[PDB]
Symmetry: C2
Subunit: 305 residues, 2 copies
């Protein structure tokens, strides 16, 4: 037993990370088949980033302006195109390590693993949630752009995030692998507002189930609540409202623990209104919202890949 | 920027994970060159675990009683031997994916990445610290034995941990790769006392440095204290004593932030005596002690592998 914030094994993605250099800018790209995906602002100088006209900038580049490095072998760029905010550099070698993969656009509250890379070599791996305001709270230094987030389903890598930028507030923003930003953000170095962030209620509930399964029961009360009363308390504390879809997602955990979803909700209501009063839950003194109901079941069932 | 509990990329270790079956027991093993390393209690039934005679149990086993599977490939066992609490299975083929590697015995307070595996297949990766009492707080379901812990230096994998058991308190215990347990534990299902756990003071200080680097500064006071005065308070709060060695290890963080170690100590003292008063540091309501100073420096410079 035990419950940890855990990332997917990163080996399948490690084999896809290359280094993409355009002029003075070097970041990471994702090499799948004969195409390398990277943030389009690799074509930008630091001055360009203040107000880039990407189409004008890209026209100034030819294929030989892109230095793509996989390990020590240089790949030969034979085509380049822009899809929303990602560049697609067609190369002449298909990545022999290309895993089975999908591009997916995830929802607020869903989680994924980030393989943080620098100069095309993997540096570390950690699990993130897409915040309800479509930022992520990651760890990204200069050169980390192009690092990807992903989930794994046995042997298929679902890529869902490519890192593009750090907002002036230090939170992180990026795109799906079709280059569409998550949230209202643009790849321009300008002040950008992330909306109010909220707590992912369904994730907190799943983690409370994770806690019960691992023996932390103190927060359990025999009270109950209606979905409506809970959401009225939830919204006072900047918790996302809980829906029936969310109740349905939590079904399996309710069934394993014998704790109806709305009973858990009453225990969460109490925690928000009365605080945790110095005790902890799964070693945390705050309510955790970075575990989806699927993550809890997976970790508590031992799913492998 | 940002600061995350970050694990090493696991790809190099993934290629070494195999499934070892003996009789009715299946766990994981580590395939390096032509040797598979696994917990010796692979030869035990559940009832053997209550009081195993490992020498007598192993005498009844032959090479063909050990089924070793690497993916879909069946390895032929051509020799078996027990070293402390690990079985070494000689196989007829060298693992072509063997990284450069070392076997290392880490110190209490050092961190490592765990690649949790089931049936020889990697499940997740997370960062752990060797507690001062030589337990780890992991996530290990039935079948995870033989999962390994490791650090990576560029291209060299330092294997430091192999998982063997969960103590009745829920914490986890294991061995180095020569089969020597960390701590006073044995591979038998009995009540086993772990020492009093304590907080890894040098790691707390490192994490405070990480917080200052990330702009979390509210906890800085302008006080200083002495090493003995700090250690007086540390002992009262079940913190490990701070040594000059630890002060030395914190030097580079002290130099980058302009905050003398004994000044950070005074801040920590005040956090201990006054609590956090419900405030947070780096998104945590507790003092985090699972980042070494090397972890902190590494994450704030972007070392790669």
């Amino acid at each position: 037993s035990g419950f940890r914030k855990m990332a997917f094994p990163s080996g399948k993605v490690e084999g896809c990370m290359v280094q993409v250099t355009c002029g003075t800018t070097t970041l990471n790209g994702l090499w799948l088949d004969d195409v390398v995906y990277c943030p389009r602002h690799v074509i930008c100088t630091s001055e360009d980033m203040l107000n880039p006209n990407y189409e004008d900038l890209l026209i100034r580049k030819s294929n030989h302006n892109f230095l793509v490095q996989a390990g020590n072998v240089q790949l030969r760029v034979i085509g380049h195109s822009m899809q929303n905010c990602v560049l697609k550099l067609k190369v002449d070698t298909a990545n022999p390590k290309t895993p089975k993969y999908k591009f997916v656009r995830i929802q607020p509250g869903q989680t994924f693993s980030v393989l943080a890379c620098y100069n095309g070599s993997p540096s570390g791996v950690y699990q993130c949630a897409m915040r309800p305001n479509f930022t992520i709270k990651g760890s990204f230094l200069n050169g980390s752009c192009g690092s990807v987030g992903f989930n794994i389903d046995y042997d298929c890598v679902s890529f869902c995030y490519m890192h593009h930028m750090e907002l002036p507030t230090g939170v992180h923003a990026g795109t799906d692998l079709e280059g569409n930003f998550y949230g209202p953000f643009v790849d321009r170095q300008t002040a950008q507002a992330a909306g109010t962030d909220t707590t992912i209620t369904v994730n907190v509930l799943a983690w409370l189930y994770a806690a019960v399964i691992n023996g932390d029961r103190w927060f359990l009360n025999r009270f109950t609540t209606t979905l409506n009363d809970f959401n009225l308390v939830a919204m006072k504390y900047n918790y996302e409202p809980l829906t029936q879809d969310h109740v349905d997602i939590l079904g399996p955990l309710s069934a394993q623990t014998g704790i109806a979803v709305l009973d858990m909700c009453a225990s969460l209501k109490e925690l928000l209104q009365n605080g945790m009063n110095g005790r902890t839950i799964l070693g945390s003194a705050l309510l955790e919202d970075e575990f989806t109901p699927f993550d809890v079941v997976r970790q508590c069932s031992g799913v492998t890949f």
